[PDB]
Each structure stands twice: as C-alpha cells, then as structure tokens.
Design a binder for this molecule. Structure first.
Ligand SMILES: [Ca+2]
Ligand SMILES: [Ca+2]
Ligand SMILES: [Ca+2]
Ligand SMILES: [Ca+2]
Ligand SMILES: [Ca+2]
Ligand SMILES: [Ca+2]
Ligand SMILES: [Ca+2]
Lengths: 113, 51, 50, 50, 51, 51
C-alpha cells in the first residue's frame, strides 16, 4: 500500500494487503489469478466489517467463523438452529432459493453447508 | 595558508537516476476502439498485444 | 523524425495511434472501459555514430 | 527565532504545541486515542538575501 | 608517465537526497485538546484541521 | 574567451548506494535436512535460529 518505495519489490499478499490497506490491485500483483483473487475480493467485501485490526482480518481470511449475520461464513455446518439438515444450495430441492450460488457466490455457498 | 573563499559554483540541479531510468510501472491492457455509431464509441480488448 | 515513404507520388508519414487502459482493471463490470494512455508510434532511422 | 512580542511590557514568545495521532481509530476501540507526535509551532522572519 | 599517486581524501560522506527531501510519510490525524478531567486527560477528533 | 571542447573521460559509470548497503530483503527461515529415508530428502524446521 503506502511507502511507495515498497511498490518496487515483490510484495507478499500479507505484507501489502492486510496490516496496511490494499485494493484489488496490489493483491492481484501478489497472486496473479482472478479466481482465488476474487475469492479474496469476496472475503474483502465481506471483511468490510473486518478491515481493522490485524487479527480481525487474519481470522476473516481464515474462514472458521461467521461475522454476525454470517456473510463471511465459509465453514461447513450442515445443521440449522434446530439442527435440521440443509438442502442443496445450488439446486431448488425442496424449496426454491431466491438468492443462490448463481446469484451470490461471494458468500461461497457449498452443497448444503 | 590563505582561504580564497570564492564560494561554490552551481546553478543547475544534478540528478542521479534508476538503472533503467524508469522506476514505477503500472500494468496495462491494450484496447481497441470499436465504432460507436449513433452514440458513444465502444471499446474492446486487443488480441494482437500481450494482455 | 518519422520516416517518410512515398505513395500517391507524394512523401508522407507512418505515424500510428495506439491506446491503452488498465489491464489493471481487466476484471470487473462493463461501461468502465475508458482509455487513459495514448501512444504515438513511429519508425526512425536509428543510427549510432561513435 | 521566535518573533518576540511585548505583552504587559515584557518580551515573550508565541510558540504553541500541536498533537497528532494516527488516522484510523474507530477502526478499532474508539477512546483508544493516544498522542504520538508533537510539533511546536512558531513564527520567524523569513528573508532570502541572495 | 609517472604515477604520483598519493591516494585521495573522502572523510566527509556525500549523501544524495530525494526531490521533496521527505520520502515516506503517514497520514496522521490532529488530536486537539479534547481533554478529559480528573485522570489522564482524554483526546478525540478535531475539526480545525484536515483529517 | 575560447572553448576547447573535448567531451570528458567518463568510461566507467558511477553508482550511488543505500545507506544500508543492501536494498531490500525478505524474511526467511532456516531449515535442516532430516536424512532422506531412502527416497525424498526430508526437511525439518530448525530451532537454532530465530523465526
Ligand atoms: Ca505499502
Ligand atoms: Ca504496496
Ligand atoms: Ca507499509
Ligand atoms: Ca507491489
Ligand atoms: Ca507496482
Ligand atoms: Ca507477517
Ligand atoms: Ca500494474
């Protein structure tokens, strides 16, 4: 990010994106593949609530927890609040999902997690 | 023994430079102008250049 | 200093215009396809004397 | 080089102090506000003879 | 023809410098005298400076 | 009154340098070779050197 002299050397994704404040650009420079890069972008938009501080973002990129409403949740829980097993997210069995993986893959909606 | 302090002689700057003479660099992408007829011109990505 | 070449019985130039934007935004949404850099290209009698 | 000013018939200074911290803050626990940088400020006579 | 070499003298270093003379920097914020009372005086955001 | 131009004698370029004598560096970690069990040589993080 800052200290533009740094904008010469090979930046680590951590060294340029986390503790500082990177946009998509320096991240991409570090990584060079829009797939995992926009996975990172989806996290970043989700980690909009996790911009500071460090840990707040290290855990947010870890993916082991839901940020309140769980827009960041990338775990694998298959039980509801009552333990009910979840349906297939991509398919509409048995109820039609209004917003699904075709609509918002940024939340990383898996099979039934 | 005696200091003939005429002072220095300089009126121009002197500059050192990067070994390539260009430090920073912003990646970029070739763009071709597709004719916007009846409106604003459209733009696409060239295939001749590297991306 | 562009090289002059003859066509139509006259000597003209071969300057071309090329356009560049940020592959830096290679990815994202449409509309935002705007150029920011213009380059003029040419050919010149490069020659080193000494 | 503080421009001395006469108040009450005595020559004194006009130097003040200014305090600075980082910029992000709400980002984390709010009141966490602390001083980090101190600047003394003042006034002088600026002349460039040559 | 004859190398009357008695070396040189470079005791004082010759640091060059950058244009603005002040490279790195870091946006900071001015904490006015938002003073608490009783204990360690508090601090808070000012509105008399650019952020 | 009269100019005896010759160019100059500048056949070796001159470089300036950073005060640390080294540009930038990338934290690294030590390792050691756990003996290859016939096949691939194994590599174990050392403890002698700091992280
Ligand atoms: Ca930086
Ligand atoms: Ca950077
Ligand atoms: Ca930095
Ligand atoms: Ca970089
Ligand atoms: Ca760069
Ligand atoms: Ca680190
Ligand atoms: Ca770039």
């Amino acid at each position: 990010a800052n200290t533009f002299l740094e904008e010469v050397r090979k930046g680590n994704l951590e060294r340029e994106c986390v503790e500082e404040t990177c946009s998509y650009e320096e991240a991409f420079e570090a990584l060079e593949s829009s797939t995992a890069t926009d996975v990172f972008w989806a996290k970043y938009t989700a980690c909009e609530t996790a911009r500071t501080p460090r840990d707040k973002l290290a855990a947010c990129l870890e993916g082991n927890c839901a940020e309140g409403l769980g827009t960041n949740y990338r775990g694998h829980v298959n039980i509801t609040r009552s333990g009910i097993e979840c349906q297939l997210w991509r398919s509409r069995y048995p109820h039609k999902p209004e917003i699904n993986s075709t609509t918002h893959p940024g939340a990383d909606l898996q099979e039934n997690f | 023994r005696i200091i003939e302090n005429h002072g220095t002689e300089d009126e121009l700057p002197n500059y050192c430079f990067p070994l390539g003479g260009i430090g920073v660099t912003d990646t970029y992408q070739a763009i071709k102008a597709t004719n916007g007829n009846g409106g604003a011109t459209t733009w696409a990505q060239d295939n001749t250049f590297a991306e | 200093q562009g090289v002059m070449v003859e066509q139509n019985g006259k000597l003209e130039s071969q300057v071309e215009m090329q356009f560049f934007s940020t592959s830096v935004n290679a990815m994202n949404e449409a509309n935002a396809i705007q150029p920011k850099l213009l380059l003029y290209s040419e050919d010149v009698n490069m020659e080193t004397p000494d």
